[PDB]
């Protein structure tokens, strides 16, 4: 069931959001938003600066202060207040879906089947671990009582992404409200408005003030004002691994703030001689052109055994010339824009080396449309382990097909990147799969299969592709911190 | 019972240990290493720099291969291997006790009956970590069987401290090992010899070459070299704030390293009217005088209720007045001297503001003797909170009592500073101490007591005092990777 | 705020449940149902018998095949049924709470801002376990994968008193349906109508059939039908130690069907001279005579310092002596009836001995009314231990107060006794108060406190108290069943 | 290398162990024990009765006192102690490993190689645990600090079996002694040597007296005494399902004191047509042959696929006639004795009704030598289901092989037992691998091996194959009894 909005939807939240109440910015200067698959303005929104990000972190602040609301109130009423915010992303899911798809340049079907039901799904699952983290008691030496207390860090800073904009603030700000910490949000500066109208039903579902402030605007300023920002306690960002860099930097030089990034990748997957062919097609394709390549861990590199390749070949071509480009809001469209002009470029010039550099297009290679930032879905055949299509993470619809015959060589290219988001396997064979996932150096790998993400799974990078986990019982650790309460008594008992 | 060495300590080994074998440095350069009792050299050690530590790299990088001893011996093995070092330490017990002592500066009594017995239980606590590091299996939505692998992360470079040199050493190594990661350890410029003697010790062990690679020399080279490297995955770091940032800031910038630092602290202790008198004394004066004052959980900052502050200080300061200053290893010697040049003057000019800024000096004041790094044990009472003294971590016999009265406002006090490594909280009412504990924003709270660390215990800093926890089971998962594992099923069963 | 229902109760839902439908007994009997507080009969409800047990056993048994419904969906989906369950109760709060109190004697406030509470508070939290019940991936010798799973159990049969129907429901389906498994639930023979509400309410929800059935009649007809039955995987049974061994010897006899029981106490108060007096008085007061003394918590023995022992009577026979005995029903109304004669009988009968054997009664001692079961409360001080009213289990409005001077001798009196459920310590002493509560021999230890439950501890008996703990992250082990996988590989690495 | 003993063994232990002491019994009978290899006496040992049960259980409890030497040390000191044990045994292996296959017929290669082994390394991971047995901190409703200690039970009895008894007394001893408890061991009658050497070895470790108590014996005398006894916390037994009936019941009717059983099996193979042929008939054949078929595991049924039956069959049987029968102790022996009559009786009366309810004999079917309870290795193939063999426990060296040709029905025929102890799965496939054994109702399911044990894993059955779990991670728990303690505060803060 693919049900729809029956009113033009309008845009009624562009504002800061500090303290449950809409603020202008303190310049008073807005910035525009666009859908990308038109390149129209479709709103503005209040543009925020260090000076906003300084009265969003107070606000912050002072919604963590010991007696608070947020701080006394039982873990069991966090969670409740999680799972009614649930309630009412799931009340305005084709609102929401509508908003993420016009203004993400993101296919109506996913915004609504995908996206806004891992959303839901997401925020219930960190809903109930609020009143189950826990700390310990520990046997120390000698006599003493020794417990521990997993208490929220405080104020965390949290810089969302454009590719999914409420998947990944409902990543970040699920797990961090469950600890009970507060936070300040900046998302994407193309794709702001999602976000102010879970605000709003932040604010309907009666968290205390000042426990979330989202401060729309750009990276370069509000993200910077963020990351080295004196009196923040921990910062999460999901991007690019060079803008990363800067921020793990930033922190540093700042306030030591705890810092966890999930970042690009160059993923691979590997193809056996033994696999069930069409399936590893199928996985393999949408593995990489999902959101129109928009993906952290899409299968950039894709690795097939010799005496099946040109098979592969032909059936992933067959595969990626079946698309239908347009407006992501028309039913049957099937691939919508990329986001915007920076993102067009860097795919495009990328499309270019691939064909300097002498890889074997079966498909695709150049621009569609007279308007919206549309590429035609690319596969590249013959590619080769020093292109700059099998190095640099695209972005975009392009695929990269490569043939191996030797294992132990195979997996030495799939681990020769500094990347190591997530790979995937092909095989049927139970100790093939076992030996080379544990050979990966790659934070999540799937086995006949590819880009399965949930709630219950931890998941973030190897090496440059990120620092921590997000979700699971796991990426819960990362927004407690951890203290140790000994206390001398007369004589311990076991 | 204190027993002692029978013999001359001979210093032995002097090189860099890389592959289980003895290397000169790639300069040959070689630099002093000194007593800080006398100012005399003890010897020369090999001088490590980026060039040495690419060798260690390398070889601890082969020894994490896929394949390898290491990578594939039973956990319970490495348990095994971790066990026997601690005998072999355990047997060289009054071997190491004298060269920490000498090299160190450090009271031999403490040296052998604290820091070789820390020094053995944290090697057999976490020896028995080993085999009992495991992921989960996760009930993933979807026919998928989904579980995680807690591997090790890989090539660690650890960076150790003076004041505790091994005791910080097997707080680093012990975990790493434990989780089945390889090791670059640089120790101390001041003090390498009692970790090269561990090296040997490693290797008679048995662990396989590269596993643990040891290079000495200074921080500015062989410690950024480590900080920067490229194929290192993480850092730890003792030290300073100031380095800690410098550290953290290099990750960043080189390859996005893992990072985990143990920092200063300006740690306070709130001692109640209705507090044990003379046992909050007794805590509050070890707790800032242990080892010279060289320990970042230093109690630098005393708060005492007006109606009992003028009977604590009079209580501390004659307990300040019985020490025996001189050669750590002769007997009854009570204070030994501050480590390094770099140290005493810092002190010196930190006890020069204290007279200046108008705090009252009850005793001490300069140094002592006519060679050593000698400070005669100092206490400060009426010390206000924008002193430097009470705001800078001075690492010197240096103690400052300060009065309250509002039991909130001192908590804001003890809580108003970048540090936050613990805490010490005096009192008999169970109400407020756990209160009180829970305001505090410091990693570690003591309660009528001060000082009890264990290897069962995680330890760490809240704010600019660290990031991350060691030992205990907690500190056991930052020394692990989190890889998740999804395998596609025809069907899942609960 | 207590609002109340608009319209007379009528019983609606009154036979067998299985598979989602209503089903006759086999035989055809009916047994009727009594309210306490009038000795008026309600209703008749379908008596369910062994042929009875049967039936809902083999809807259990093909509820939990491999490849059903319930054991195929996500665990997450599992979690959904739970907390729609908890919504679904939440809309019947006024109707289920009056009829609990109309059917179980007990305070309609109570009832309703408590049980009911707690009822709807318990569920949501075990929804919350459903997705996170994991099992591990283990470092196991040799070359192998070792995983394990935390199966569902499988029929789990379930036995439920008369106290607190509803929330001894839900403490028992809660976690049991989190964790996968199938019941066959036999609410208590006085006490049936609110879970046959709460089935209406499980197939509203979309319970697949046969997940929960519900077998209304006699313990030792339908009762021993469960627990001797060679089908039933696991039994769960609150109620007397004396049917408790019952249980247990039968579980053993048919099956060796996993057991887990919540039996009678004969709980101890330790206040000391130092404790607040009022705050011990208070707690200690509504700790035994909370729902008419029918707790198995009830705080029976309350062992005083000598030196505050007249002052602790004195201020309890005055609280004693300030109820309202009625109707449950009726505002204003603070103490209800017993709930049947089999209790009134040995509650007086236990009443008399403590005349006989000398206890000094303040107040109450005998019956109230010309119809219901009431007992006036009742307080004896003086009371020793070798006197009928300290050993055995009134379950009914009847306080103990005993004098000690003597700690050590005091808690071998307090642990003196084949129950261990629970026990409670006043003192504002930090040392007193961890190692009495350490000392003690009881399975809940309160500090300055009394009778605090919530789902988010575990709760259960030392001793004859109990076998296993129910809720909390530790009781959800007794409702899984560990497999562990070990799969041979080529060759591990850690 | 298999070394050996160079001089006769001498039997030294044979009295009864309790605080640390040498006890005759209190009736002054003595039992002997045999050799199963001749038949002939080795010696004569203290034969205990209830009455000496009783001494050792007051000795127990005085042990577990709150206060005691035992319940006071550091928890890494249990460990130490546990280690110390295991370093013991390892200086004894030769002389141990001579005793236990002496005493119970056991190859001494086995013995030696693996029984030894196992021992140790048991020991040395439960040693490693004891320090890391924590409780948590929770975040209960309300202003509340809740903590929960993982405390000892206390008095653990512990029946252990004849078939390994080495391994089975250190899987008992080693979990209850790292978590705190204290223990009175009852070895098996025909068994008791080794265990006595252990409790040597426990008195020259230094463990208190009281903690170890070891009482030789017989089972419906010493272990009736056990199982019945009013001050003994919990019973641990392994052996047939028949007699922990006994002990569930007798635990139901004495003092509800805990139980955990680890019992028969009839433990199945399915091996399915694309599994390597070789490794499954090897793992098959070592599954049932093990140790004389007496083991608790025993792969007694064996399915193999229709189209590989017939050289499934040929292959097992060419592999079953290689033995060589004779005394344990001589090398080149193969296959030793059964234990005794009542065994070897049982056994053949079995192997009679093979032949009579018409299996195929392929091999073997009646005893062997003068003397010695020797039995030939037999083989069974076309065995069905309502036959003898195919449904009961024969714990001896007799194999059954069956056809199957569908997957479901297979399935559920492995699963048409009351016992599931453990099953093994032969396939290359990937996902019937995952499926199968997630369907198997058997608490240790191996896939491409069998009887692969290890102390990192929990082992135990499903259904009438045991209660609980032993060893890992998980079978810890059963050790520990929770007690939650809460306590009022003024406000709590996350
Ligand atoms: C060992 C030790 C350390 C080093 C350390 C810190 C954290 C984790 C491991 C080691 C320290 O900094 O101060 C101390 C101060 C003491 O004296 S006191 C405060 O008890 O009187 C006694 C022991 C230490
Ligand atoms: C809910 C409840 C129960 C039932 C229960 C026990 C364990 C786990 C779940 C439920 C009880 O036995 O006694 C109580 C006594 C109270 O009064 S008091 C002791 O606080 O004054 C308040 C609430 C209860
Ligand atoms: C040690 C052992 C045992 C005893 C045991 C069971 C569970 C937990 C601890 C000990 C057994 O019953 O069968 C076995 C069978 C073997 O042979 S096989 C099945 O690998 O070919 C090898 C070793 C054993």
């Avoid at 032909?314 to 099937?334: C, D, F, H, Q």
């Avoid at 392009?398 to 681990?415: E, G, H, P, W, Y």
Wanted: glycine share 10%; charged share 25%.
């Amino acid at each position: 069931d693919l049900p729809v909005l029956l009113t033009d939807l309008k845009i009624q939240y562009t504002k800061i959001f500090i303290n449950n109440e809409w603020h202008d910015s303190v310049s008073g200067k807005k910035f525009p938003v666009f859908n990308p698959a038109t390149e129209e303005e479709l709103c503005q929104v209040e543009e925020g600066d260090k000076e906003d990000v300084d009265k969003a972190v107070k606000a912050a602040r002072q919604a963590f202060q010991i007696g608070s609301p947020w701080r006394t109130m039982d873990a069991s009423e966090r969670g409740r207040l999680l799972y009614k915010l649930a309630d009412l992303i799931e009340r305005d899911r084709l609102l929401l879906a509508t908003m993420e798809s016009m203004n993400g340049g993101k296919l109506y079907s996913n915004a609504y089947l995908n996206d806004l039901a891992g959303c839901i799904k997401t925020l219930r699952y960190c809903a109930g671990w609020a009143d189950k983290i826990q700390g310990r008691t520990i046997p120390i030496d000698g006599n003493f009582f020794t417990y521990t207390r997993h208490e929220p860090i405080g104020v965390c800073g949290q810089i969302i992404p454009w590719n999914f904009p409420l998947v990944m603030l409902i990543w970040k700000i699920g797990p961090a409200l469950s600890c009970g910490n507060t936070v300040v949000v900046k998302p994407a500066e193309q794709t702001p408005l999602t976000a102010l109208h879970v605000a709003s039903l932040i604010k309907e579902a009666g968290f205390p003030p000042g426990v979330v402030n989202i401060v729309p605007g750009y990276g370069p300023t509000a993200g910077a004002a963020i990351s080295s920002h004196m009196d923040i306690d921990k910062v999460a960002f999901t991007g690019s691994t060079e803008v990363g860099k800067l921020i793990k930097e930033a922190a540093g030089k700042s306030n030591l703030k705890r810092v966890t990034l999930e970042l690009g990748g160059k993923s691979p997957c590997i193809v056996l001689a033994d696999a069930d062919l069409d399936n590893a097609v199928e996985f393999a394709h949408h593995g990489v052109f999902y959101h129109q390549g928009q993906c952290c861990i899409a299968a950039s590199r894709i690795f097939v055994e010799e005496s099946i390749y040109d098979e592969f070949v032909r059936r992933s071509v067959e595969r990626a010339k079946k698309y239908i480009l347009g407006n992501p809001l028309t039913p049957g469209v099937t691939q919508g824009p990329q986001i915007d002009k920076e993102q067009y470029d860097k795919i495009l010039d990328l499309i270019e080396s691939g064909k300097k550099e002498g890889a074997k297009l079966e498909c695709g290679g150049g621009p569609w449309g007279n308007k919206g930032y549309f590429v035609q879905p690319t596969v590249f055949s013959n590619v080769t382990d020093e292109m700059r299509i099998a190095k640099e993470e695209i972005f975009g619809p392009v695929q990269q097909i490569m043939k191996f015959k030797s294992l132990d060589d195979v997996i030495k290219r799939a681990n020769n990147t500094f990347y190591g988001l997530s790979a995937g396997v092909f095989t049927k064979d139970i100790d093939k799969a076992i030996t080379i996932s544990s050979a990966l150096q790659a934070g999540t790998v799937w086995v006949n299969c590819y880009g399965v993400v949930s709630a219950q799974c931890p998941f973030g990078g190897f090496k440059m592709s990120g620092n921590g986990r997000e979700l699971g019982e796991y990426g819960f650790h990362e927004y407690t911190e951890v203290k140790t309460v000994t206390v001398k008594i007369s004589q311990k008992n076991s």
